[PDB]
Amino acid sequence: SELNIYSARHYNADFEIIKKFEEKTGIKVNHTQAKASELIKRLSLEGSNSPADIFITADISNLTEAKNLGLLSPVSSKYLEEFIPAHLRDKDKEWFAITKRARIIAYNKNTNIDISKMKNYEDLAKAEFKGEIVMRSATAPYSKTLLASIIANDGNKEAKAWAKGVLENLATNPKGGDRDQARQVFAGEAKFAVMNTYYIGLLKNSKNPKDVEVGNSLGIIFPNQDNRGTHINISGIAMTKSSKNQDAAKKFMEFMLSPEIQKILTDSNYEFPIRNDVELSQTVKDFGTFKEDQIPVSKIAENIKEAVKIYDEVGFR
Ligand SMILES: [Fe+3]
Numbered sequence: 001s002e003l004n005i006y007s008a009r010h011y012n013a014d015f016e017i018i019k020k021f022e023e024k025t026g027i028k029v030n031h032t033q034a035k036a037s038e039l040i041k042r043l044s045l046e047g048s049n050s051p052a053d054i055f056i057t058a059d060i061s062n063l064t065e066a067k068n069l070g071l072l073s074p075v076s077s078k079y080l081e082e083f084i085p086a087h088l089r090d091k092d093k094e095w096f097a098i099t100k101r102a103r104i105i106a107y108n109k110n111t112n113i114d115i116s117k118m119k120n121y122e123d124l125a126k127a128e129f130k131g132e133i134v135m136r137s138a139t140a141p142y143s144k145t146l147l148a149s150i151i152a153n154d155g156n157k158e159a160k161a162w163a164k165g166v167l168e169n170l171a172t173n174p175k176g177g178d179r180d181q182a183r184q185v186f187a188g189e190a191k192f193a194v195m196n197t198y199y200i201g202l203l204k205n206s207k208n209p210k211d212v213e214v215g216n217s218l219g220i221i222f223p224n225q226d227n228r229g230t231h232i233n234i235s236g237i238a239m240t241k242s243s244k245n246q247d248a249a250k251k252f253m254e255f256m257l258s259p260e261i262q263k264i265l266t267d268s269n270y271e272f273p274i275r276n277d278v279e280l281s282q283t284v285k286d287f288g289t290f291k292e293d294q295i296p297v298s299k300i301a302e303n304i305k306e307a308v309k310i311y312d313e314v315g316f317r
Helices: 013-025 036-049 060-068 078-083 121-125 141-154 156-169 178-186 197-204 209-216 246-256 259-267 282-287 297-301 304-314
Strands: 002-007 028-033 054-057 096-108 192-196 218-221 232-240
Touching: 002 013, 002 036, 002 246, 013 028, 013 246, 013 259, 036 054, 036 060, 054 060, 054 246, 060 141, 060 232, 060 297, 060 304, 078 246, 096 178, 096 197, 121 141, 121 156, 141 156, 141 192, 141 232, 141 297, 141 304, 156 304, 178 192, 178 197, 178 209, 178 218, 192 197, 197 209, 197 218, 197 282, 209 218, 232 246, 232 297, 246 259
Parallel strands: 002 028, 002 054
Antiparallel strands: 054 232, 096 192, 096 218, 096 232
């Protein structure tokens, strides 16, 4: 009858998906969108009394934070286990990926720009790029999880040095999110933006012609192709321990991995599907092929607390 979703996703495509669920099942969805940090705090304070049934994020670490705050409940679904690879879901069955996305370095391909020395995440922190980089706030999930991945791969001293150098190199204080950083590259205010791949698709296919202009100017560097490969993060989903509509919650989680919905996620939101039998949308194919970091996303997320402290220490936020 009702299903209460707390979502840190921030996409128009989700509205269509939810309508399709309502149409299919007759269940009314109450959709609450806010920042992940706000939702996790809210879930903690509301506790067992929360009306929430579902927590959706655009980030692995937010799911693990929620798990480790005792806020989620395990789901044993043959459907989810068949179609989500084990490396993309919790061993303890409390969180499950619905998409993949890659955090890349974007440049203005309508300029002559030498990208030969901007090859790895490490390079963003190099003195030669002072004043040439833009990135959103350190408090953003994408930023926290990227730094956590650097800790996991290269250690906490490289992480701190990276964070410090990135801060020093920013063309501007962080101003809005990925699409705003992309506009700064379009406008020539910075040479390189740290951003997720799907935003390039959203922009290029936008019904707002100004978004199309921005998206059309972007080239992609997939970082670290000569070594470990590019940072992958997930959007994902969990049932809350507070859930009183558990059947609906499980139905919704399975619906997010259904063929039609995985196709919408790539066709309409330009993300990578989790299912291995869903063709990429043509825009996403145009991003190109690339090497992905093989690290389990769960292992990245083990470093989230320290990532927060490092960004705080070097002077973000
Ligand atoms: Fe996003």
